[PDB]
Design a protein around this ligand. Structure first.
Ligand SMILES: Cc1nc2ccccc2n1Cc1ccc2c(c1)nc(CNc1ccc(C(=N)N)cc1)n2C
Lengths: 252, 10, 27
């Protein structure tokens, strides 16, 4: 996370680290949506251009973490993957459209003061909050600069940007399954997700019921925190139907 | 630079 | 989820984190 700050303890209890076993390393960010379901970006698992195509056994899910590199005894819980589900229409060929994936953990994780699920938005919640100017929150252990790594989970609040502005900031084709966030060159403030943050959550706290909802998944970006560029996010609600069906088809 | 995790998970 | 989005160390004990107000002020 570029230009963010250290997360408070227990500030993002749904934060999940997608960890590579061999070598042992941070692969991506992710989020806890129930005791057995972890949500992330499809690109974190399958992405041919970067020769990425992980299988369950290649991965480990680290939940309840704060420190980046340290094994947090008695706090974090490390789970194994039973199955990975990637959106059937995820398009890595043209533009990372429908960049979303679900991972079912082998056995339920126990909630604690550091482990707790985030809500998925309903139609009304999404309509009311997914508006230009409204701020969301992005967290992760990714790079602090485009070109180091944080010691602790970083957090940054960023404003949703008008779709026209998002489109005009890049030559890439934006789809309705994506949204962008971040400050404009003249807004003074800054911050953005970066390498190591993808797959992570973009959440918003509903002022109607005081609950945190995950509106986006760190998807793609050009550089990190570049003036005139914005971070793009998978529109979670737009793909909720897929989420619903997978969870009640193969889930618990 | 990741601290060793319990071998029980690998 | 029935208790989703309510954090044990914050919402659960009516404590607010250091920057959430920024979010709510933008709504
Ligand atoms: C070359 C190209 N053609 C595209 C078509 C559609 C979308 C992105 C595209 N890109 C650039 C591109 C492509 C794939 C990418 C990407 C950036 N970035 C990631 C993941 N990491 C990442 C890095 C930086 C940021 C950010 N600054 N907000 C967010 C995510 N993947 C998995």
């Amino acid at each position: 996370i570029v230009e963010g700050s250290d997360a408070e303890i227990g500030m993002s209890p749904w934060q999940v680290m997608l960890f590579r076993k061999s070598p042992q390393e941070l692969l991506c960010g992710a989020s806890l949506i129930s005791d057995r379901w972890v949500l992330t970006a499809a690109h974190c698992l399958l992405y041919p251009p970067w020769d990425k195509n992980f299988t369950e056994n290649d991965l480990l899910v680290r939940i309840g973490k704060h420190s980046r590199t340290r094994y947090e005894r008695n706090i974090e819980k490390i789970s194994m993957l039973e199955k990975i589900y990637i959106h059937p229409r995820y398009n890595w060929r043209e533009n990372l459209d429908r960049d979303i994936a679900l991972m079912k953990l082998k056995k339920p994780v126990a909630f604690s003061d550091y482990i707790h699920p985030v809500c998925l938005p309903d139609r009304e919640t999404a309509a009311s909050l997914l508006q230009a100017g409204y701020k969301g929150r992005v967290t992760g252990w990714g790079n602090l600069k485009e070109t180091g790594q944080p010691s602790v989970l970083q957090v940054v609040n960023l404003p949703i940007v008008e779709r026209p502005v998002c489109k005009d900031s890049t030559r890439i084709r934006i789809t309705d399954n994506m949204f962008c966030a971040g400050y404009k060159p003249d807004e003074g403030k800054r911050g953005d997700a970066c390498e190591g943050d993808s797959g992570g959550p973009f959440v918003m706290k509903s002022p109607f019921n005081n609950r945190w909802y995950q509106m986006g998944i760190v998807s793609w970006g050009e550089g990190c925190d570049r003036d005139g560029k914005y971070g793009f996010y998978t529109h979670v609600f737009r793909l909720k139907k897929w989420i619903q069906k997978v969870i009640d088809q193969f889930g618990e | 630079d990741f601290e060793e995790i319990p071998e029980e998970y690998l | 989820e029935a208790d989703c989005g309510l954090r044990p160390l914050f919402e659960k004990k009516s404590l607010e984190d250091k920057t959430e107000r920024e979010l709510l002020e933008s709504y």
